[PDB]
Amino acid sequence: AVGACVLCNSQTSLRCGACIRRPFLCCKCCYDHVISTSHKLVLSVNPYVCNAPGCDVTDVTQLYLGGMSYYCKSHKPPISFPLCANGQVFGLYKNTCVGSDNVTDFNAIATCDWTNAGDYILANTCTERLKLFAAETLKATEETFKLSYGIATVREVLSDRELHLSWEVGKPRPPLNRNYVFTGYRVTKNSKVQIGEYTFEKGDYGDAVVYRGTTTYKLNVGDYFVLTSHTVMPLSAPTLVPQEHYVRITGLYPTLNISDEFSSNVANYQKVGMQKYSTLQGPPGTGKSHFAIGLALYYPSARIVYTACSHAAVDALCEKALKYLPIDKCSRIIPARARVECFDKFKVNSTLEQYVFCTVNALPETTADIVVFDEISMATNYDLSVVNARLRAKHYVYIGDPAQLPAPRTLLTKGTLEPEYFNSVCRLMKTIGPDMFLGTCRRCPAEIVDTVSALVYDNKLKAHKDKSAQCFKMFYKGVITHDVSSAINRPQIGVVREFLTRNPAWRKAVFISPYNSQNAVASKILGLPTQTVDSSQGSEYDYVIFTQTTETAHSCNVNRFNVAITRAKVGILCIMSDRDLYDKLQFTSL
């Protein structure tokens, strides 16, 4: 077909056959791409391959156009010519191809396999028309890494609360964080149909699962889980529209005598209605969805479309809408497959509603007046492009938090990403700061809360309490074994267990560790419930016990203590072997 070059928007009909997505290139850009790197395959409306009866020649620079077909030196007719000549490669629109110099970072974006962190460092600084193609090829290479993977299957029906898994032997069984969905399949007479899309979580003893569910179909013997294979599918819209300002509230007219339980948010809603797009940074425990309900009810008469990238967030906003929002004028959007345990109590699946709850995973191409995006650090630039293409609104709000879970980016293993390089909107929330925030913490005592607000924040959080004073930091020597792919520190837990008789308070103690093997063996020698750091961001507790195994990069990142230790409301027994985690939060010494 014919369209625009990816980096100069000139008319062209060339596809570089060696790329992942094979994008459009003009003659100048395709030529420059096929001299520099190893990419030596180009596709016009007909492929640039040697059209001999039998031959294998694909490099255009030694391919020759003879008559009607393409040939190499071995079998070309005496008539010229080489396609790759005169500083160009043959193709449509030779008169309108404008040259450029962005071939360097284009090659860096194309030939990379996205393993090291510098690829994501380099994928966000570029001109953003190239950033869409970078996001598309990153999602595509993630997909092809996913396609070379093995399936799961359930053993039997074991229990309602927990299941057990059976796996075909030979290829690795995964990490089970909630971010890795597995699609079920009824292999019945003789058809294969989708029923449920489960994730799993690390077991108690041997092979076990604490799961999260999709459909009330009870899973029988003939059910095996494939991870997922939803294709990356082309994107057009930019990740962000330009920031333009309006003199008044355009397209939105207020109400009268709304409410007073969020009375410190009206001018915030006005500033939302002034400009094009707004950002609110939400620290843990602020009521971001409550702010969403308030802004929706300020203009109770226009399109407010709620979109959350993840389905925990849409469940949260659904129960929030039950708590506050009027019921009948709301619509949750169910996908074609009913991807999770869908909350169906409203006017579900109505494209002609006002308050629309949906996921980017199954957005329809509808209109909007102001759109509400949720959980930004989850959202990748591909999803931002999708939500901009499918949903169009006069005003935008983006709520999320950089310090929380970012997007997973399972291909990245070496080099921790900095919070602005999570996505574009996170970069906007750091570089120029957030357009708003809700500065209030309602779970943390004064000392812990101003230590987290001193480490990264601008002291934005306070305490609606005084210090509880069972938040302890210990000097644990931590003899390690790590006779597993993870790290194990049992005698350190033995020291902690040699305590806890001087503390009658926290006997419901919640074990929290960033290391998985210690998490699994935690409820083994001692009968205290155990949860990893992946159980955070939505749950709050009163008594948390922390056992740190190693002092390394995984145990040095501060966001991740921020998401782990904020769960404790009135008490945390934080035991570490690190000498640097120490003056950051000034606990007692003992």
Partner: protein
């Protein structure tokens, strides 16, 4: 309250209800489930404790055979069952459901109300006639009485159940034939609706009432519409012995399949009923997905002969009894016309044709004399017509 709950169970459907429970509480009954999951299996008589029952009373305060089951379970099961019922609402062979949430203590429990069901189900009748016990049979007497098959004084008889001291029990059982045939037809309609609506599920005998309506969608997986399949392996198979005990297909020997119309005026010379057998199979056992050969000569093996013969032994009870027996054919030997049997029309094996017929023979050897003297074609053709009233068995000739 115990009265507000009943008034809600009423709904738009104007009826009066008499509580079989006690103060909006679950009534415990002792039914005959067909259940298969990973911990219990088989066709056994269980005890269900999840259904409050209310009996509808018509004019004259007479309690009739029409109940209101208001089974209550969790919220997401209510959700899925509403969705599946909405997909399957238009089918006439579906019990009219009613979905509502009600207040019990301070909390909302969802109740699904099935309307106008019989007291017993298909599985109850199948279990009563399949696990019979002459000392303890109260779910069979009640079924026989409530549908006017007997008079409730038939059970005072010396032997009301024995087939050799009381052949009239066959006539008594035959009164359920038109109640089972309509149930089969409604099963076909429900299967067609599931197939068109794209719903995958397993049809059990305990999910269809004695009228024929289906009312349970607990494990009905929905898929792309038009690609769903019903699993009727365990439905038609247990019900299979009942289809001839109660003579459920005796209405197919009447024109327009109406019990008031006279008999089909069958042709005497007709012996090949392959098309009629196929039509009956596709009308009743439509979604039985195994291959059915009316003539058993085409069967795959000895496990296909039994299956097609099992279907034929019922499909041959709607055809005239004079169309069976050997198939004779006028052959000529030595210029003289024989009449010999060149085949058979089995009731079970269908039509079987001889592979070696010699229409124009010259010399008859001892083997040929033996064959042509053994077969009854010669004697029955030569003999006089007989009408023996001493026996009910068919008489051919004397």
């Amino acid at each position: 309250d115990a009265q507000s709950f009943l008034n809600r169970v009423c709904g738009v459907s104007a009826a009066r209800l008499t509580p079989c429970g006690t103060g909006t509480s679950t009534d415990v009954v002792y039914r005959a489930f067909d259940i298969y999951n990973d911990k219990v299996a088989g066709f056994a008589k269980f005890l269900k404790t999840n259904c409050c029952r209310f009996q509808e009373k018509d004019e004259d305060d007479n309690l009739i055979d029409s109940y209101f089951v208001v089974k209550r379970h969790t919220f997401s099961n209510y959700q899925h069952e509403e969705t599946i019922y909405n997909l399957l609402k238009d089918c006439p062979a579906v019990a009219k459901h009613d979905f509502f949430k009600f207040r019990i203590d301070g909390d909302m429990v969802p109740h699904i109300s099935r309307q106008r069901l019989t007291k017993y189900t298909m599985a109850d009748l199948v279990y009563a006639l399949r696990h019979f016990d002459e000392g303890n049979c109260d779910t069979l007497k009640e079924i026989l009485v409530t549908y006017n098959c007997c008079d409730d004084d038939y059970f005072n008889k010396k032997d009301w159940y024995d087939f050799v001291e009381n052949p009239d029990i066959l006539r008594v059982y035959a009164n359920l034939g038109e109640r089972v045939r309509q149930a089969l037809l409604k099963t076909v309609q429900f299967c067609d609706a599931m197939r068109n609506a794209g719903i995958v599920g397993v049809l059990t005998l305990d999910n269809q009432d004695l009228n024929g309506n289906w009312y349970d969608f607990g494990d009905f997986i929905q898929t792309t519409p038009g690609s769903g399949v019903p699993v009727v392996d365990s439905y038609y198979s247990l019900l299979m012995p009942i289809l001839t005990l109660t003579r459920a297909l005796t209405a197919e020997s009447h024109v327009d399949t109406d019990l008031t119309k006279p008999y089909i005026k069958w042709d005497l010379l007709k012996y090949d009923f392959t098309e009629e057998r196929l039509k009956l199979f596709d009308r009743y056992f439509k979604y039985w997905d195994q291959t059915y050969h009316p003539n058993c000569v085409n069967c795959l093996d000895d496990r296909c002969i039994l299956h097609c013969a099992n279907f034929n032994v019922l499909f041959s009870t709607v055809f005239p009894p004079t169309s069976f027996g050997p198939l004779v054919r006028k052959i000529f030997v030595d210029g003289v016309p024989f009449v010999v049997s060149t085949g058979y029309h089995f009731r079970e094996l269908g039509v079987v044709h001889n592979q070696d017929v010699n229409l124009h023979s010259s010399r008859l050897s001892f083997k040929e004399l033996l064959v042509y003297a053994a077969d009854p074609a010669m004697h029955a053709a030569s003999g006089n017509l007989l009408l023996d009233k001493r026996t009910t068995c068919f008489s051919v000739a004397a």
